[model samples]
Target: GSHMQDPEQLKHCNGILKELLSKKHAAYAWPFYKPVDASALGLHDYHDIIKHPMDLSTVKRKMENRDYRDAQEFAADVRLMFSNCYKYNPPDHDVVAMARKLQDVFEFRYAKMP
Candidate 1:
């Protein structure tokens, strides 16, 4: 199951998303370097509508298929979306420490495990 959004308690849902996105690592199975570790990694466009549950199914259906034609189409769509998102929006910092944060979170949460 995915995490619940405490919209009622929070002032803005986006803030909650920002908090989550700001964290080092979210829930995932395998341990790896965070996206922030990538030289160009940045947060998803803050203006993009923050969905309650990020749609893993969509990624599964589209990206997991990975046919050449479909991949090309998906790449085009992602390019368009990134262009639209970055056109007007500027990041507050060149790079946010999403990796370190996730690493810290993972260590804190799972360090006790054998």
Candidate 2:
């Protein structure tokens, strides 16, 4: 994909990212803010289960790096963070719940972006 050429849309996406990490969703989003250390976590099958591991910090850096061509692309990674979690964890788990809520906020805000 090409760079997100519109400063207004890019800026809007950045704001939505910050909002996800705010008090309202911080606890839920914290676990996904960084890349997963499968070795340290003792998850031998983590990489096997999740081919594409995505996180907020990953998205933020990529966003700033011009990796996303549009808000939709940025949103795709944001959504990936949750999808990966869902695949690795069982349904109805606390982590899944957290990811679910965060995804809700992301989708809602992305819909209104410039």
lDDT of 2: 0.85
- Cα lDDT tens digits, model 2, 1-114, are 445466678788999999987898887888887899999989999999999998888888898788877776787888888889989999988989988988889888888976
Which ranges of candidate 1 are over 4 A from the true structure?
1-60, 65-68, 91-114
After superposition of all CA atoms, the RMSD between model 1 and the true structure is 15.6
Tell me how candidate 1 scores on lDDT. Answer: 0.31
Name the best candidate (by TM-score).
2
lDDT of 2 at 46: 98
* Model 2 worst lDDT window (10 residues): 1-10
What TM-score, computed on C-alpha atoms, does each candidate reach? 0.24, 0.88
